[PDB]
Amino acid sequence: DLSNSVFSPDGRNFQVEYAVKAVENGTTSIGIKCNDGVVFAVEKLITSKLLVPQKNVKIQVVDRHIGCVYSGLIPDGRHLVNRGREEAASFKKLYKTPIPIPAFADRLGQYVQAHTLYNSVRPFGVSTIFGGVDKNGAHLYMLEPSGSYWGYKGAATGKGRQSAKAELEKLVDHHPEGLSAREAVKQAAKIIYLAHEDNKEKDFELEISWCSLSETNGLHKFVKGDLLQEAIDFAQKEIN
Amino acid sequence: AALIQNLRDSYTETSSFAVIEEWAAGTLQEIEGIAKAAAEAHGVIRNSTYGRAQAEKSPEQLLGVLQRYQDLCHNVYCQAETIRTVIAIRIPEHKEEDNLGVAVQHAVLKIIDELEIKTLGSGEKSGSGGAPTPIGMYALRESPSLLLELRQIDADFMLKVELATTHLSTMVRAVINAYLLNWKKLIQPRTGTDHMVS
Amino acid sequence: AALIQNLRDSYTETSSFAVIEEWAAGTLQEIEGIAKAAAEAHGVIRNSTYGRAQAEKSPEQLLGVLQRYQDLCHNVYCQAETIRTVIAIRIPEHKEEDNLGVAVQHAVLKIIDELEIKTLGSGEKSGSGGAPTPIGMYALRESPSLLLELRQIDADFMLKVELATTHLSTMVRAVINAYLLNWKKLIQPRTGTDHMVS
Amino acid sequence: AALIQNLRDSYTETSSFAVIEEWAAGTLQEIEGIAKAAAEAHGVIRNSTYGRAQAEKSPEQLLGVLQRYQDLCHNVYCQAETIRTVIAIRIPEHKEEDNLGVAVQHAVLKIIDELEIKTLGSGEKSGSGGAPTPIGMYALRESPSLLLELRQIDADFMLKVELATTHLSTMVRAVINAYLLNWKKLIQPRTGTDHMVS
Amino acid sequence: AALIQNLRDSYTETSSFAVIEEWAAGTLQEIEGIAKAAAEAHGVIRNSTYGRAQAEKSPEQLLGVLQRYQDLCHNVYCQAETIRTVIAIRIPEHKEEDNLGVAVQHAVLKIIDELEIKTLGSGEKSGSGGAPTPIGMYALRESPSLLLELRQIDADFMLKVELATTHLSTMVRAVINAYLLNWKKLIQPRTGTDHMVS
Amino acid sequence: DRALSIFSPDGHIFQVEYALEAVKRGTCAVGVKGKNCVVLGCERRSTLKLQDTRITPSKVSKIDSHVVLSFSGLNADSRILIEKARVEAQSHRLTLEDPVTVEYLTRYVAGVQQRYTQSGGVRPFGVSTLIAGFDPRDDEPKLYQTEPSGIYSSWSAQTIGRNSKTVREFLEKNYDRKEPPATVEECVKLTVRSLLEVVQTGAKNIEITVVKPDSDIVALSSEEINQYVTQIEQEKQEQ
Amino acid sequence: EYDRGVSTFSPEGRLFQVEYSLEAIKLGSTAIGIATKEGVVLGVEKRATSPLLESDSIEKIVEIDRHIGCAMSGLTADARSMIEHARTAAVTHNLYYDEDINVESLTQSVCDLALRFGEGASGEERLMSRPFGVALLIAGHDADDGYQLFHAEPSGTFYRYNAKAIGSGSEGAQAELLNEWHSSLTLKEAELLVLKILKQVMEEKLDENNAQLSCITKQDGFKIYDNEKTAELIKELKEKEAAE
Amino acid sequence: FRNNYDGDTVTFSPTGRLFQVEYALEAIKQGSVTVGLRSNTHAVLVALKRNADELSSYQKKIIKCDEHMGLSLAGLAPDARVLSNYLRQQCNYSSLVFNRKLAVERAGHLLCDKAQKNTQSYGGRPYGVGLLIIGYDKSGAHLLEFQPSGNVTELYGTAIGARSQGAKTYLERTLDTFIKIDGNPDELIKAGVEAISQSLRDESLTVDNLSIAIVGKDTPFTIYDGEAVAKYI
Amino acid sequence: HITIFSPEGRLYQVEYAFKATNQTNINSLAVRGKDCTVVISQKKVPDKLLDPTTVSYIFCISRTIGMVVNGPIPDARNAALRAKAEAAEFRYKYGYDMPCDVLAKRMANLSQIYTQRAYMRPLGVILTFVSVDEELGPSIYKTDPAGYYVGYKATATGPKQQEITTNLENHFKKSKIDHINEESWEKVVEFAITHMIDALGTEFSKNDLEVGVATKDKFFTLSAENIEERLVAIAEQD
Ligand SMILES: [Mg+2]
Incomplete structure (x- = not known):
């Protein structure tokens, strides 16, 4: 059970479970596929008053059209992003057309894949949420340590995933036609607050980004500023 | 296979955390019953330490204590055997994986196990309390030290109560703690939600 | 879960370093009580070593010693059981990590454990001090060596006190040291501030 | 923390190599006291081996020996318990490093430990030397071999002295050596000057 | 440190291979003394196997043998304790290296150790040879098998001599060998000339 | 703690130590010098003799016209060193014209023995060695010893292999530090008797090779070596 | 004894393999360095197995350049390596800048050499498994901080x-x-x-054979005191003790 | 009694922890103390040079990487030098190629992604040293907290090292004040100095024990050695 | 434990490897038509938060070759890729499109190589390749992690193997030929669903399943809608 490559008496790779176990342990991240484009949000945890706000960004863009966030082991996340960054930019130079989100995941899945094959390497310790647009719409997926990922209507990992899960559940049915680009944000703003109630004694800072041909204009922009505020307040009222 | 699961089912279905929660809770306040069985034997060693000599005939207040103590060992042991029952019923299929949960179960069993053993080296001392005195009260025909040995066989047995009681409290409290921490692992020892890889 | 933590809470809340500090401090100066229980039995072996023969009848000064000693074992054992109680209440959730702290707890328990065992191979010798003499004082009808065996059964039991006392001091002192060093690990066995990685 | 160190301090401050040096030095020349307790019991087995039969009555010279021997066991044991005390007081904070020094301490304790055990399988043989003879001197009413068994129970117990003495010398000498070599490791088990890396 | 080495010195200085060479040499030819203690007890079982019944009274030739045997055990044990002494004095500073030499010392000690143990399950059988006969010679008032059991308790004890003797020869010889081979390692267990690297 | 590329608590590399234990297992060599010569003595493990006398090997080996060496330990190994040394002996002369300095040589050799004690997945040469000779256009006799670890050292006279400790002692109170054995004849006389301790009669177990300056060199014949055993047993009986 | 394997961290965050290497240097014969505004001295205890070894054979003190000397302690094979890298590091610099290297700058290079050992390499190839079993007493003089004395420790640090x-x-x-x-x-x-x-913490009767002595100055550079100077200097020493 | 999950940097504990990396942080807690604190005009590093013996020098803990950047360290010298060294290149690459002065956020990025590698591959071990970084780009002042675990955080001030607590608090409190000390260097320092002296135990700081570094709006990164810091005692 | 012979030469990592293929929990069946081929696999979508489009255990390797795999999605996507490119590289290097039976060879070959040289852990998946090549027509070959392939006239992979199997076997002892007599695929499809429903003691809606068809050089995955209509078809006719 102690090495990364090996299998258990009935086909099981334990190192990957623990990988998963560490992914949960970290902060909580989410994402939502709406009308056209997507919306992400994470949970920066203010551990002291000596932290400059609006600063240590956990969300990162890829190319100029892909949002991206995760949780678990922070440096692991960062690392993975780089590879994704090359692959993208290489492809782009090659085919000219900005990279299809559908395949992108694989490129990454395939890379996270490998780190489950050899014993000399350590499994990727992060679950990753992301999405973007293209010609045939916006997409959103979520990659785990096992390397297995898929397309979701909205995703979640880290500490309290259920909170946001059952929360994401509702939205589906009342808005079975994709939630408004705008409302998407402010709604995400809330779904976070609700899920934070574990680090409750410890204050925090919410970060949000999104994509949309109508709002962002095909791009990925950081939800900061005015829309950002009201989106909070919006959450702050339902916060009762 | 249809019938087979039903048994394993209706069995685990008649005992649970719901049941065990009451032993921890029950044996929580019930320590008072021991913090008492203590102070009683104490007040008593003073009368024996100082209630100079006699001409014999079985002390009524002493048996009142051993009866009260042997009485307690009984309760506890049954109460423990109940917790033990709740766990043995949750021991998963034997194999060489996920043994993290299983391990907890075993470790806790060994401590509970100990508790029960403790209640059995003294949970009989009444039929033994008056077991050395028939030999002691005999030889009724006199060592002036034999008279004093009767003074002692009374006080000695009162000390054993106070002491067994003292340790006992500790054992119980330890067990309370131990359960309260693990427990969930005790009932749910394998998860198996790890099929997120297939 | 709300109620569950409250118990584990109010329990650790009624015993602490605050409590144990007083045993270390209490059993610090109290060694004098032992450095005394020593010199007493000594002065006494000389009278037995030289107080030639007799015609029997239970020595009052000797029981004065055993009563004083059996008296001490009692104190100490209760006092230890208290330190023991303080730690068992702090044994963390069983698992295969952070076991550095947990280990300390166990090691210390084993040494404390020993102390208690030591106070029980002789913490009964009064009811046994006069237990071989009723057999020794009988056979009142004479070996001129049997008369001398009574001289010995008095001195022998005075040696056992001096000796048990000597060792005992050592055990205590060891325990004092051991506690004073680790302790913080004993109450805070897991830290868990390592979330500087997530 | 201010008060806490003071105790650990004033304790290690009243025992030291300074103290132990005298046991090694004390129990150095004192072997003569044993090289003697030897030659005495020897001269004595010859009189028992040849001092044909009798009509009984407790031999004065024999008890002179057992009293002298049981006398020595006493000294030694107290003297050892002192060396033991000096070390237990220096057992460092329990952990999984620098255990090279700690290991020495333990090994030495196990050998001292043995010494003490050796002085207790025979450091009572006086109250036992005359313990089989009250049974042997009785049955005063005659096996012509029983008469000879009394000749033996005298010589047998004189052999046990010579032998225990012989082994004992060895044990002591071993311990002297063992201490003299390690010691510094015994008091200074961790160094900790390795901060030349930070 | 000046004085400290002097003791460890003058001690090893009064025992050596020079000494041990004489035990191996002494207990070399002295086996004749055992090859003899053998043949004696043999010639004797024939007279007991065939010297039909009697009316009792302690056999003189039998005690002549047990006295001669118990006599030998004594010599040997003292002689062994001497070899044991020579080694314990050479046990180097305890550590985790060069333990090749040290290991030898221990192994040899365990074998010597055994030798001494062997001389003690029978090195007392005289005070025991006549220890079952006082019980056997009594009940002087007759089982016609009890008469024969006396015939046996004489022959049985003559067998034990022959047998203990047989094994003993073996043990000794083994030990002779074992020493003769290693020895130099026993006195010089560490070398330390390896400073050809610095 | 033995499988070295790691340290003992007291800072040892026990493997490297053990390796030396093999040099002792092996045969024996001894070198001596004068103020004109340097003799190299060795013994002969004449044990399963049903083998052609002629072509089967002999300890002393020439590395260059003016320098030679001997060893004790694993033959299997030794050979490989000798070869690699001989090679470097020329690689120098080529790239520098000037023929090698005996000190340099050793340093090279010791560098190799030294190389086999660093990378994991290699084991040390179970060979210690004596190297003698006279530097180019120089008349000062040079003697060096190299051993398994990688240390090189210059000696006035030294010995290696089984029972070196003994003969060493002998040498110690014979070889005058103040003045070295003058004449060649007697410088030999010396070495020969120093080996007579372990030999156990017979110049049939004693190899002598002698080296002078200006690349002269010359192994010894059996009788020559015998005429010494003779002229020594003689003065021994005369004492 | 678990926690003794080179790149392994003790749970108190410590590296024993390293720490033991230090314990190697212990076994070396003693070396002493003294810096005076007048010049710097380097003296070492020799300790020879037999009288047949030619003292000067033991290179415990060696020249690294006209302006920098050195004394080692412990593993002799390992010494030769550090000595050679150093000797090279020096000359190289002079070829590049036509000047002399700053004692510490040199010293640095040597410590830069030491801690440069990997275990399969988590990035950087480092061909050499374990640390050095030797320390150094580097002692020279650059014209920026005048006379200087340093301690080279296998840990890759120095003072x-x-x-x-x-x-x-x-x-x-x-x-x-x-x-x-x-x-x-x-x-x-x-x-x-x-x-x-x-002489004090030495072992035998002190004399030129068991003790090599050297020094270096702005004036003449690193010079290794022949047996004469040392011999007499012993006298000026063993004489003043008689008095006080 | 046992723990197998702490073998290589490469193995996960059943819960999802890397003990090896956890230990490296312990050696971080073992080294000397040091402090950093920023505002809007400058950044300051203050450290306690610790010497071995009394006849030896105090081992320095500050390093420059460019006119505008630097750091202090708590832990292993070697490890540190390497990291700082790598850092030095990274700035140079930017200057030569692009001719732009390296932004601190980004400086931390690289030191994350660097130290990161050692947590994922067999054979090696992780970096035993923490760093407080300071610098002054186009987004004014900045200050960083770096761990071997590859976590770099942007702060307002902090301390690392043995007994680093007492300063972290002094800072936590006196915050509202110093974040406003703009235009005055000596003030930020005295402030920083007090924050640190608020952690000594062996004794007070002297000219030899002390070391300071600063960088700002017109103050290229410079360090103050010994008798030069004399005033701030 | 590890990848090198047991005492009875059976290195279990390869054996263990198998359970994991199975472990996923899905049933895959396949049968030959006459001018087409078909495979059945279940499509159990638990999490109501995912998107059925993104789910599948069948992918389009080539213009005519499809693949199904009873096994863990991460490892499958790998095999998928390599294979997908081996054929890509083939057509290029040789002038003609690579057939079923062959890909399965380099594929088994590949998994053998790994296994023997130790350059990685075997993937825990069983690949079931399908198509129709104009040399052997309706082709069906399967491969396992223990690097090994062979041929099937119709096969199955899953937690419940032999059941799906035995049915077909019995249906075969009677139909007596070594394939399915019938001209239209729709019709064959119907047939399999049929033989599976019957085989599970279970019923499927229009999304609970997953099926593919290999035609005369134009392989295509069966989508959500068309899929249902076959259930319509096979409802009355039953
Ligand atoms: Mg592998």
Whole structure:
């Protein structure tokens, strides 16, 4: 059970479970596929008053059209992003057309894949949420340590995933036609607050980004500023 | 296979955390019953330490204590055997994986196990309390030290109560703690939600 | 879960370093009580070593010693059981990590454990001090060596006190040291501030 | 923390190599006291081996020996318990490093430990030397071999002295050596000057 | 440190291979003394196997043998304790290296150790040879098998001599060998000339 | 703690130590010098003799016209060193014209023995060695010893292999530090008797090779070596 | 004993393999360095197995350049390596800048060499498994900070000293030095000083054979005192003791 | 009694922890103390040079990487030098190629992604040293907290090292004040100095024990050695 | 434990490897038509938060070759890729499109190589390749992690193997030919669903399943809608 490559008496790779176990342990991240484009949000945890706000960004863009966030082991996340960054930019130079989100995941899945094959390497310790647009719409997926990922209507990992899960559940049915680009944000703003109630004694800072041909204009922009505020307040009222 | 699961089912279905929660809770306040069985034997060693000599005939207040103590060992042991029952019923299929949960179960069993053993080296001392005195009260025909040995066989047995009681409290409290921490692992020892890889 | 933590809470809340500090401090100066229980039995072996023969009848000064000693074992054992109680209440959730702290707890328990065992191979010798003499004082009808065996059964039991006392001091002192060093690990066995990685 | 160190301090401050040096030095020349307790019991087995039969009555010279021997066991044991005390007081904070020094301490304790055990399988043989003879001197009413068994129970117990003495010398000498070599490791088990890396 | 080495010195200085060479040499030819203690007890079982019944009274030739045997055990044990002494004095500073030499010392000690143990399950059988006969010679008032059991308790004890003797020869010889081979390692267990690297 | 590329608590590399234990297992060599010569003595493990006398090997080996060496330990190994040394002996002369300095040589050799004690997945040469000779256009006799670890050292006279400790002692109170054995004849006389301790009669177990300056060199014949055993047993009986 | 394998971290965050290597240097014979505003001295205990070894054969003190000397302690094979890298590092610099290298700058290079060992490499290839079993007493003089003395430790770290001693009786001297050293020590003073602490915590009767002595100055550069100078200097030493 | 999950940097504990990396942080807690604190005009590093013996020098803990950047360290010298060294290149690459002065956020990025590698591959071990970084780009002042675990955080001030607590608090409190000390260097320092002296135990700081570094709006990164810091005692 | 012979030469990592293929929990069946081929696999979508489009255990390797795999999605996507490119590289290097039976060879080959040289852990998946090549027509070959392939006239992979199997076997002892007599695929499809429903003691809606068809050089995955209509078809006719 102690090495990364090996299998258990009935086909099981334990190192990957623990990988998963560490992914949960970290902060909580989410994402939502709406009308056209997507919306992400994470949970920066203010551990002291000596932290400059609006600063240590956990969300990162890829190319100029892909949002991206995760949780678990922070440096692991960062690392993975780089590879994704090359692959993208290489492809782009090659085919000219900005990279299809559908395949992108694989490129990454395939890379996270490998780190489950050899014993000399350590499994990727992060679950990753992301999405973007293209010609045939916006997409959103979520990659785990096992390397297995898929397309979701909205995703979640880290500490309290259920909170946001059952929360994401509702939205589906009342808005079975994709939630408004705008409302998407402010709604995400809330779904976070609700899920934070574990680090409750410890204050925090919410970060949000999104994509949309109508709002962002095909791009990925950081939800900061005015829309950002009201989106909070919006959450702050339902916060009762 | 249809019938087979039903048994394993209706069995685990008649005992649970719901049941065990009451032993921890029950044996929580019930320590008072021991913090008492203590102070009683104490007040008593003073009368024996100082209630100079006699001409014999079985002390009524002493048996009142051993009866009260042997009485307690009984309760506890049954109460423990109940917790033990709740766990043995949750021991998963034997194999060489996920043994993290299983391990907890075993470790806790060994401590509970100990508790029960403790209640059995003294949970009989009444039929033994008056077991050395028939030999002691005999030889009724006199060592002036034999008279004093009767003074002692009374006080000695009162000390054993106070002491067994003292340790006992500790054992119980330890067990309370131990359960309260693990427990969930005790009932749910394998998860198996790890099929997120297939 | 709300109620569950409250118990584990109010329990650790009624015993602490605050409590144990007083045993270390209490059993610090109290060694004098032992450095005394020593010199007493000594002065006494000389009278037995030289107080030639007799015609029997239970020595009052000797029981004065055993009563004083059996008296001490009692104190100490209760006092230890208290330190023991303080730690068992702090044994963390069983698992295969952070076991550095947990280990300390166990090691210390084993040494404390020993102390208690030591106070029980002789913490009964009064009811046994006069237990071989009723057999020794009988056979009142004479070996001129049997008369001398009574001289010995008095001195022998005075040696056992001096000796048990000597060792005992050592055990205590060891325990004092051991506690004073680790302790913080004993109450805070897991830290868990390592979330500087997530 | 201010008060806490003071105790650990004033304790290690009243025992030291300074103290132990005298046991090694004390129990150095004192072997003569044993090289003697030897030659005495020897001269004595010859009189028992040849001092044909009798009509009984407790031999004065024999008890002179057992009293002298049981006398020595006493000294030694107290003297050892002192060396033991000096070390237990220096057992460092329990952990999984620098255990090279700690290991020495333990090994030495196990050998001292043995010494003490050796002085207790025979450091009572006086109250036992005359313990089989009250049974042997009785049955005063005659096996012509029983008469000879009394000749033996005298010589047998004189052999046990010579032998225990012989082994004992060895044990002591071993311990002297063992201490003299390690010691510094015994008091200074961790160094900790390795901060030349930070 | 000046004085400290002097003791460890003058001690090893009064025992050596020079000494041990004489035990191996002494207990070399002295086996004749055992090859003899053998043949004696043999010639004797024939007279007991065939010297039909009697009316009792302690056999003189039998005690002549047990006295001669118990006599030998004594010599040997003292002689062994001497070899044991020579080694314990050479046990180097305890550590985790060069333990090749040290290991030898221990192994040899365990074998010597055994030798001494062997001389003690029978090195007392005289005070025991006549220890079952006082019980056997009594009940002087007759089982016609009890008469024969006396015939046996004489022959049985003559067998034990022959047998203990047989094994003993073996043990000794083994030990002779074992020493003769290693020895130099026993006195010089560490070398330390390896400073050809610095 | 033995499988070295790691340290003992007291800072040892026990493997490297053990390796030396093999040099002792092996045969024996001894070198001596004068103020004109340097003799190299060795013994002969004449044990399963049903083998052609002629072509089967002999300890002393020439590395260059003016320098030679001997060893004790694993033959299997030794050979490989000798070869690699001989090679470097020329690689120098080529790239520098000037023929090698005996000190340099050793340093090279010791560098190799030294190389086999660093990378994991290699084991040390179970060979210690004596190297003698006279530097180019120089008349000062040079003697060096190299051993398994990688240390090189210059000696006035030294010995290696089984029972070196003994003969060493002998040498110690014979070889005058103040003045070295003058004449060649007697410088030999010396070495020969120093080996007579372990030999156990017979110049049939004693190899002598002698080296002078200006690349002269010359192994010894059996009788020559015998005429010494003779002229020594003689003065021994005369004492 | 678990936690003894080179790149392994003790749970108190410590590297024993390293720490033991230090324990190697212990076994070396003693070496002492003393820095005076007048010049710098390097003296070492020799300790020879037999009288047939030619003392000068033991290169415990060696020249690294006209302006920099050195004394090692412990593993002799390992020494030769550091000595060679250093000797090279020096010349190289001079070829590049036509000047002399700063003692510490040199020293640095050597420590840069030491801690450069991997275990399969988590990035950087480092061909050499374990640390060095030797320390150094580097002692020279650049014209920026004048006379200088340094301690090279296998851990890849180092310190500047006024006086330092490595080897067998490390403390035996360090204690002594700790209260013998003072700025205005002249050179002649310093010599007789090293020469005293050696003799003390030394082993045998002190004489030129068992003790090599050297020094280096702005004037002449690193010079290794022949057996004469040393021999007599012993006298000026063993004579003043008689009095006080 | 046992723990197998702490073998290589490469193995996960059943819960999802890397003990090896956890230990490296312990050696971080073992080294000397040091402090950093920023505002809007400058950044300051203050450290306690610790010497071995009394006849030896105090081992320095500050390093420059460019006119505008630097750091202090708590832990292993070697490890540190390497990291700082790598850092030095990274700035140079930017200057030569692009001719732009390296932004601190980004400086931390690289030191994350660097130290990161050692947590994922067998054979090696992780970096035993923490760093407080300071610098002054186009987004004014900045200050960083770096761990071997590859976590770099942007702060307002902090301390690392043995007994680093007492300063972290002094800072936590006196915050509202110093974040406003703009235009005055000596003030930020005295402030920083007090924050640190608020952690000594062996004794007070002297000219030899002390070391300071600063960088700002017109103050290229410079360090103050010994008798030069004399005033701030 | 590890990848090198047991005492009875059976290195279990390869054996263990198998359970994991199975472990996923899905049933895959396949049968030959006459001018087409078909495979059945279940499509159990638990999490109501995912998107059925993104789910599948069948992918389009080539213009005519499809693949199904009873096994863990991460490892499958790998095999998928390599294979997908081996054919890509083939057509290029040789002038003609690569057939079923062959890909399965380099594929088994590949998994053998790994296994023997130790350059990685075997993937825990069983690949079931399908198509129709104009040399052997309706082709069906399967491969396992223990690097090994062979041929099937119709096969199955899953937690419940032999059941799906035995049915077909019995249906075969009677139909007596070594394939399915019938011209239209729709019709064959119907047939399999049929033989599976019957085989599970279970019923499927229009999304609970997953099926593919290999035609005369134009392989295509069966989508959500068309899929249902076959259930319509096979409802009355039953
Ligand atoms: Mg592998």
